[PDB]
Nucleic acid binder design. Structure first.
Lengths: 130, 108, 267, 125
RNA sequence: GUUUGACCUCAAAUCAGGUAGGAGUACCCGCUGAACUUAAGCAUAUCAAUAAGCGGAGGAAAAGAAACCAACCGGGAUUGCCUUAGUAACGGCGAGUGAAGCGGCAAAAGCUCAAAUUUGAAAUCUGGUACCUUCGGUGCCCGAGUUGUAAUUUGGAGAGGGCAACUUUGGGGCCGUUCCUUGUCUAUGUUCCUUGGAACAGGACGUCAUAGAGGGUGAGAAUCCCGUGUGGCGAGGAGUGCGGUUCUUUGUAAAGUGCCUUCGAAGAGUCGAGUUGUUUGGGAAUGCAGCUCUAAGUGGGUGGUUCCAUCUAAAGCUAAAUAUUGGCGAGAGACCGAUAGCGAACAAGUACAGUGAUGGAAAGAUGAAAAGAACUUUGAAAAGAGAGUGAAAAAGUACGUGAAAUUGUUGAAAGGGAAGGGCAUUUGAUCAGACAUGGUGUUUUGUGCCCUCUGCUCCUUGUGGGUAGGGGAAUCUCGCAU
RNA sequence: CACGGACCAAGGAGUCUAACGUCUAUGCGAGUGUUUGGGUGUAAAACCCAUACGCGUAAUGAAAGUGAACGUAGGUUGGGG
RNA sequence: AUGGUGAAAACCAUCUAGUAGCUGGUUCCUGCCGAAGUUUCCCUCAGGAUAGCAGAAGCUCGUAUCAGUUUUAUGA
RNA sequence: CGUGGAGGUCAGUGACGAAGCCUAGACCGUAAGGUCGGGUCGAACGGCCUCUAGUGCAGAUCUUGGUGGUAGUAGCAAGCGAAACCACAGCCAAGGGAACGGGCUUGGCAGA
RNA sequence: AAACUUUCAACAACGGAUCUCUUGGUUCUCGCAUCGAUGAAGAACGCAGCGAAAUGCGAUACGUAAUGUGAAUUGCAGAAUUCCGUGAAUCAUCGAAUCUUUGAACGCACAUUGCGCCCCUUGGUAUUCCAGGGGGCAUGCCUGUUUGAGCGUCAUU
C-alpha cells in the first residue's frame, strides 16, 4: 500500500492500540447484586442458570435461590401548593361541605371546577390540616 | 466469488455482542417476550411458531396496558389481528404466566 | 546497501594509496639530501613480527640420555599390521640413525615384555612408527632404562640428493625454552656423535615455532664469506607430545588444542 | 504458554520491535544482574545499567576480569567497560563491546532516582 | 397633507456570525453507458440494469414501521444468511435467463408532521448585550413570527367534559463502580566437567512453574536479560449506565388508567388514462421518465370466485443484524523465501526513458567484535611484496557457502583430410586390500556371584528377584583369570 | 524436405472451482445429511443440538381420478448352494 | 470500445489473460496388456451420430463353447 | 524413486562439524535413485508411518543472468575494439531405389 | 621431439547457482471511524558542526515549550553535567507554540518572485513625507445588521 508504507517508514510512530482482551471479558454494570454474584469464568447463559434468572424467553435454537431472594428483598421497600391550600381555606370557611354551593360560587371558585375536583382536594387538605 | 471464511469469526462476534447486551441489560433476558402464532398457507398451518408481537386485545385481556407492556419487555404488534380463538387463549395464558414470573424493580 | 558501500570504499582505497605514497615520494626526496632522517624512522617504526612479540643437570645428561661413551643401539619397531609405506619409512631411518635393528613386531608382548627383551639384548632406545591409513603419522622415541619418552606427529614427507656412507654433522636451532632443550637433548642423544667433517653432510633440526623441521644438505665453501647447499634426504615436520616420564606411565606436557589459542608461548 | 490475546508470539514482529526499539526501551533491555553479595544486601535480582558503577564480567574471553563502566552504547546494545580493552596494532586502545546480560554488577552507583528505583522493586538500601 | 408616515420589494457594506468547494474512494447511494465475445450473418436474446466517465455520502450507506404478503385452525417494519430452487416463469424453448410468498435463523424499536382555534391574553424562537456554576443558564433589549411559532393529536385512533371518596411524579452537584489513555511492581543455576574463539552444546547435579508463548545475549537458554502467567498499586480523561452521598423539590403542575356523556378534519398537476423511450428472464408493459388530459370521500389502492379478504398512497425520522482489495490499529498462516513474494526486503514508484499522457528496473548476507591489514618495501598513479588482527581472511568492504558454461598455467595422454559412443582387453597412472589373532580338549593354581554357615529385602506361585557378615578349597570347571 | 538447437545455471506448462455423472471405500439404513445457525470450548480447532429443509421411502393418467393377495405376494421349468 | 495525451494523421492507459476452423513446447523409472487404419445414414465438407479392433467389472457357466483347417454328405 | 512444507515417530543426526558443493574414490538398487569414504565448508538437518502441493525439464526463433567461438578480425574519417552468425564436421570417385546426399559401403588417398 | 590442436586431471580465474538465513511481501481474521477555508492531500524553496536518499521540520527550521523516564549521544569531530536532580538524551509522550513559497487557493492579475488598497502603527520636527513592524481586503449562499432606493401599495382636514 501507498500510505501504509510511509507510516512504517516515518519517525512519527503508529497509534498502537491493544484492545483485544477487553472485547471478551466485559464487566457487568447495571446491577450491584449481580456485580457481586457473577462468575466471569462462566459464560453469559451459564451465569444466568447459576443465579436462577432466565436468559432467554423463547425456545432456543440448538441444545444445552441464593441470589433471587436478595432481589425480592429490595422489592419489599406529594403535597399541595401554598396558593392551593390558602384558596381551599377560603372555600371551607365560607361554605363548609356544601359542594353544590361551592361550585356555583363565582368569587372564590374562579376556575369552574366540578364537585369531584374540589372535594378531592379538600380531602387532601383535611389530611395535612383539620 | 465470495467465500465465508469468517463463519467461526462471526459466531464469536455474535456471541460477544450478546455478552455485551447481557452486561448492559443486566437482569433482563436479552430478548422480548414474543407471542405464539399459527403459520400461514395449507402446507404449514399445522406448525405453530413465534409471532412478532401480541395485540392490544391480548394485552388488554391479560391485565396490563399497551404502552406499559413495552416497558416490561413485551413485544406489541398493532397490525396483527385476533381471528383465531385458540391462539388468543394460548397467548393470554403465556402473558399471565410471564406476569407471575416478572419482578419489576422500583424507581427510587 | 552494498551498491553504495562498494563505490564509497573503492574510492577511499583509491584515495588512500595516492595519499600514502605522495607522502612517501616526499619522504624519498628528503632522504636523498639527509641520510640521518631515514635512520630515526627505523628506530620508532618497527615491523613488529610474532618472534619480536613472543609472550615470553650434568648427572641427567647421562642418566636419561645416551652420551659419547658407547655406540647407542636403537630398537626400530613398527605398529602392528603396517604396510609398504611404514617399511619405506624404516629404510629412511635405517640410514640416519646410528645402529638400528629392525624388528618385525608380531602381535602380543604388550610393552613391558618388550622391555624385558631389550634389557637382555641390551638396547638403549626404542623407536616405533605408526600408520592410521596409507600415510605415516606418528613417531615415538623412548629411552629403555628409566623411560623418558617423546611422541611426534609428521605432516610432511616429499621426495635428488643421494648421500654417501659418511656420517652427518648435527645442528640445532631455537631451543631457548627448557622443554625445547630437553627435546634438543633427545636428538643430540639419538643421532650419531661421530661427525667425520669430510663427506660434508649436515643434519638440521630447526624449531622457530613449536614445529621442528629436519633436513640434510651438502655445504660448499667459497672464500668470499658464503656457503652453498643442495637439498638431500627426507623432508620432514615434527610435533612434540606427551613426555610420558615413565616407560609410558606419567605425563609432562601432552599437547592440547586449549594450545593454539595463545598464538604465542612456544614450548 | 501465551494466554493473553494482546501479546504476540510472532518472530518477525518481535525481532523488529527489538531492533527498532527507542533509547528509553533499550535502557530496560540492557539490564544487568547483581552479584550474590548485593542481592543479599538490597533484596533485588537485576537492574538497568549506567556509567559510574562497577562491574564484573562473567562470560566471554574476558572471563573474571572486572572494572567500571565507561559508556552505555545503547545503539549497539553494548557496554564499554574501562580497563577491559583490546590493544590495536598501532599501539592504540579500543574498548570491547560487552553485553550487560553477561556482566554482573559488584558496586552500584546510587543516585536519588536510583534509590527510588530500588525502593520501588521491593528493596532495602 | 404639493408635507409626513406605514408596509412590501429591490439594495448595500473590507459590518457580525456562519457555511459550500478540494483530497481520499474498498464498500454504499444516484446519473450516464460501450465493444471484443454467445446462438451461423447480427436488430432483440447476449457481453451488460457491466468497464470507463459524472455526481454525492458515511462508519457503514441504503432500506424501513405497510395504500404489504396471502387464501390458510392467517402472517405482520426493514436488512442479511440457510432454504424454497435451478422451481414458477420467460427465452427463432435454443447460448439459456432466473425470482418471490411461506419455513429455519441472525438482529430486533419504534415513532414525528400535515390535518378542526392558545384565542381568558405567541404560551415559541433568533440575535445583541449584561452576568453566571459556559458543549450552556438567567435578566434586559432587538428582531422573526399571526401568510402561524409553542402546548395538546397521528387511526393502535383521538379530543371535550363528568364520575373514580382512583394511581404515578422533577432537577443539580459530591465520592465510587464502569469505559478510554497511560505509568509502575510481581518466580527460579550463570552450580561443576568435557569440547569450542565464544556455551546458549554434550554430561553430571538442582530449582520455578496460573511463567517450558516469543525475542535478545559471541552456536539449540523455562531457570542470564526483556518479556510471558497470575495478581497488585496508580495518574490523567470520558460519562448518565447505577451505587451510594446530599443540596433543592410547587404549580389549584404534569400525566396514566376504567366507566359515562358530546364530538370527531388523515396529504392532487397526485391517483389514473393514451403514447413515445428506457428497465427486466417479468408472460396481466413490471418499474421509471418524457408529453396530452386529468379524479373521488358510507372514499381509494391491491388480490381471491356474484361477493369477500386485505391495507390507507401522493410527507418525514430511526439504531442492530449486512457490505468493505481504502484508512486507522491489531492478531494470525499446512503461504513465498531474493529470476519467489507487491514493481520495490537495499539512496524504489527511486535511477532512468519518453514533447507529453505515461512507461519504469537492477541491487539482500565480512566477522562475535572492524580487531577494515599498523609498520617496512616495490610504483607519478593503478596495484603488489614482506609483516600482522581473527577461530577461519582457505571471511577481505571485488567481502558466508562459491556450482556449471568459459579462461589461463602446470602435469599426463592423443593427433597422416573428423571427434565423442558400445562390446573386450592390454599397457601407463592410480586407489582399495583386517588396532583379524583365535577355536577346542586336558593340567597347575589363584579368585568370585562357587561350596558352606548366618541373614536381610521386593513381591506373586514356583520353575521367583535383589542384596550382607564369616569361613573354605585337601574335589571341582561352577565361572573367570594365569 | 522444413522448423527448433552457440554453451551453461535458474525459472518454466493438464492447475483450481462449480455444475453433473462413473466406479471403489467408509458410515448408517427406509431412512439419511451436526458445522444457516444456537450452546460450549484449553478458542478460526474440537465437542453437543432445537426447529425446519434437502433427497429417498407406493404407483397407474391428457383436463376430471383411482390404487396394487385368486396367492408359501404363483403355476411350471431351470437355476450357486 | 471507453477515457486521455500530442499534433504543418498519431500515441498512452484500461475493457482484455479479447476471441485461434491453429503454431511451437509440455518435466521421473520399471513392469504388464496393446490397437486401429474403418462399416452404414445423419448429407459429406467441419464436428460428430454408430459398428469394428483393445480393456474394465458383474452374471451363467467350464464346457462339448468353438476354429482363417481337412473329410464325407446334399445342389447349381 | 525424488522435491518444498504439515501431523506423528525414531528420548534420530549434529561446532568432536548439520546443510550444500566438488571428487582419476567405494558399495547397493534392472532403473528412477539411495548409501558410504576423501576434500571443501560453517548451522541446521534426515530415515521411518501418514498428509499436502506453486513438486521432477534438453528443446518452446522460451524468460532471466552469465560465458565462448567469430577476433585481436571488420573497424578508429604501435594502441583501442564489435556485431551478424554458430547441432556438429567440412578431400575426390563410384553405389547408396524415392527430382535426399554431408555422416554410410567400396576405392583413390592423407604428415604438423 | 618441441610448438600447435584436442581430451583428462590439478591449481588458479570468471560467474553467482545451490544451501542456510530474513526489520520484506501475500492472504485470512478481529476491532475502531480519525482529512480540508482554523486552510488538507500534493508541489517547491530551505533548515543539522560535518549529509545522498529516507525520515523530521519551517527564519522558533533533523526543532521550541509541556509531561514522563532518569544520565547519555556516538560514522567522525567537538561541546557538556554539579550526576543525591528542574535533568544528559537523533529518548518516550504530546494537549501549547511557530508554521517559508504555493496548492480547493482566497486583494488585482497573468506564465508579472509585478499591481495595490485599508486598518493598527515604532521610528526618521514629523503638519509635509520616508522607513520598519502586524493584521486583513476571493466567490456563492443562510441568519442578521444598516444606510438607502423604488408613481410597488396604502393612509393623510
Amino acid at each position: 500500500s501507498v500510505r501504509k508504507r510511509k507510516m512504517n517508514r516515518s519517525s512519527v510512530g503508529k497509534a498502537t492500540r491493544r484492545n483485544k482482551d477487553k472485547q471478551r471479558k466485559i464487566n457487568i454494570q447495571s446491577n450491584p447484586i449481580i456485580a457481586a454474584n457473577w462468575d466471569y469464568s462462566l459464560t453469559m447463559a451459564q451465569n444466568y442458570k447459576k443465579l436462577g434468572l432466565r436468559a432467554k424467553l423463547q425456545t432456543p435454537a440448538g441444545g444445552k435461590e441464593t441470589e433471587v431472594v436478595k432481589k425480592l428483598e429490595e422489592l419489599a421497600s406529594r403535597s399541595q401548593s401554598e396558593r392551593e391550600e390558602e384558596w381551599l381555606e377560603k372555600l371551607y370557611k365560607k361554605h363548609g361541605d356544601d359542594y353544590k354551593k361551592m361550585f356555583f360560587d363565582k368569587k372564590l371558585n374562579i376556575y369552574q371546577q366540578s364537585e369531584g375536583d374540589l372535594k378531592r382536594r379538600l380531602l387532601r387538605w383535611k389530611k395535612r390540616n383539620g | 466469488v465470495k467465500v465465508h471464511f469468517d463463519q467461526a469469526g462471526k459466531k464469536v462476534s455474535r456471541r460477544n455482542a450478546r455478552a455485551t447486551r447481557a452486561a448492559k441489560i443486566a437482569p433482563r433476558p436479552l430478548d422480548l417476550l414474543r407471542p405464539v402464532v399459527r403459520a400461514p398457507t395449507v402446507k404449514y398451518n399445522r406448525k405453530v411458531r413465534a409471532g412478532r408481537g401480541f395485540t392490544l386485545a391480548e394485552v388488554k385481556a391479560a391485565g396490563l396496558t399497551a404502552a406499559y407492556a413495552r416497558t416490561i419487555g413485551i413485544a406489541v404488534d398493532h397490525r396483527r389481528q385476533n381471528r383465531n380463538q385458540e391462539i388468543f387463549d394460548a397467548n393470554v395464558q403465556r402473558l399471565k404466566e410471564y406476569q407471575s414470573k416478572i419482578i419489576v424493580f422500583p424507581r427510587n | 546497501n552494498k551498491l553504495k558501500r562498494q563505490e564509497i570504499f573503492a574510492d577511499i582505497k583509491h584515495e588512500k594509496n595516492k595519499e600514502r605514497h605522495t607522502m612517501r615520494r616526499k619522504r624519498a626526496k628528503e632522504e636523498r639530501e639527509n641520510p640521518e632522517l631515514r635512520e630515526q624512522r627505523l628506530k620508532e617504526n618497527v615491523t613488529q613480527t610474532i618472534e619480536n612479540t613472543r609472550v615470553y643437570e650434568d648427572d641427567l645428561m647421562r642418566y636419561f640420555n645416551s652420551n659419547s661413551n658407547e655406540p647407542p643401539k636403537i630398537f626400530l619397531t613398527t605398529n602392528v599390521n603396517a604396510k609398504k609405506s611404514a617399511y619405506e619409512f624404516a629404510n629412511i631411518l635405517i640410514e640416519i640413525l646410528p645402529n638400528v635393528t629392525f624388528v618385525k613386531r608380531k602381535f602380543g608382548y604388550k610393552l613391558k615384555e618388550i622391555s624385558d627383551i631389550c634389557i637382555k639384548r641390551n638396547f638403549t632406545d626404542i623407536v616405533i612408527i605408526n600408520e592410521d591409513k596409507k600415510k605415516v603419522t606418528g613417531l615415538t622415541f623412548i629411552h629403555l632404562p628409566e623411560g623418558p619418552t617423546f611422541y611426534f606427529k609428521l605432516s610432511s614427507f616429499v621426495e635428488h640428493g643421494r648421500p654417501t656412507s659418511h656420517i652427518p654433522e648435527l645442528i640445532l636451532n631455537n631451543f631457548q625454552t627448557r622443554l625445547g632443550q630437553t627435546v634438543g637433548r633427545l636428538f643430540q642423544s639419538i643421532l650419531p656423535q661421530n661427525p667425520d667433517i669430510e663427506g660434508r653432510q649436515v643434519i638440521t633440526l630447526h624449531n622457530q615455532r613449536d614445529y621442528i623441521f629436519f633436513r640434510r644438505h651438502r655445504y660448499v665453501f667459497k672464500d668470499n664469506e658464503r656457503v652453498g647447499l643442495q637439498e638431500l634426504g627426507p623432508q620432514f615436520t615434527l610435533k612434540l607430545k606427551r613426555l610420558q616420564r615413565g616407560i609410558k606411565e606419567e605425563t609432562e606436557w601432552e599437547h592440547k588444542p586449549e594450545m593454539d589459542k595463545e598464538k604465542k608461548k612456544f614450548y | 504458554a501465551k494466554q493473553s490475546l494482546d501479546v504476540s508470539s510472532d518472530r518477525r514482529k518481535a525481532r523488529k520491535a527489538y531492533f527498532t526499539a527507542p533509547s528509553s526501551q533499550r535502557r530496560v533491555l540492557l539490564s544487568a544482574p547483581l552479584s550474590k553479595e548485593l542481592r543479599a544486601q538490597y533484596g533485588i535480582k537485576a537492574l538497568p545499567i549506567r556509567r559510574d558503577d562497577e562491574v564484573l564480567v562473567v562470560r566471554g574471553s574476558k572471563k573474571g576480569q572486572e572494572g567500571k563502566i565507561s559508556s552505555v552504547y545503547r545503539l549497539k546494545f553494548a557496554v564499554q567497560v574501562d580497563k577491559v580493552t583490546k590493544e590495536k596494532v598501532n599501539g592504540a586502545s579500543v574498548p570491547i563491546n560487552l553485553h550487560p546480560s553477561k556482566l554482573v554488577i559488584t558496586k552500584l552507583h546510587l543516585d536519588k532516582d536510583r534509590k527510588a528505583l530500588i525502593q520501588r522493586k521491593g528493596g532495602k538500601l
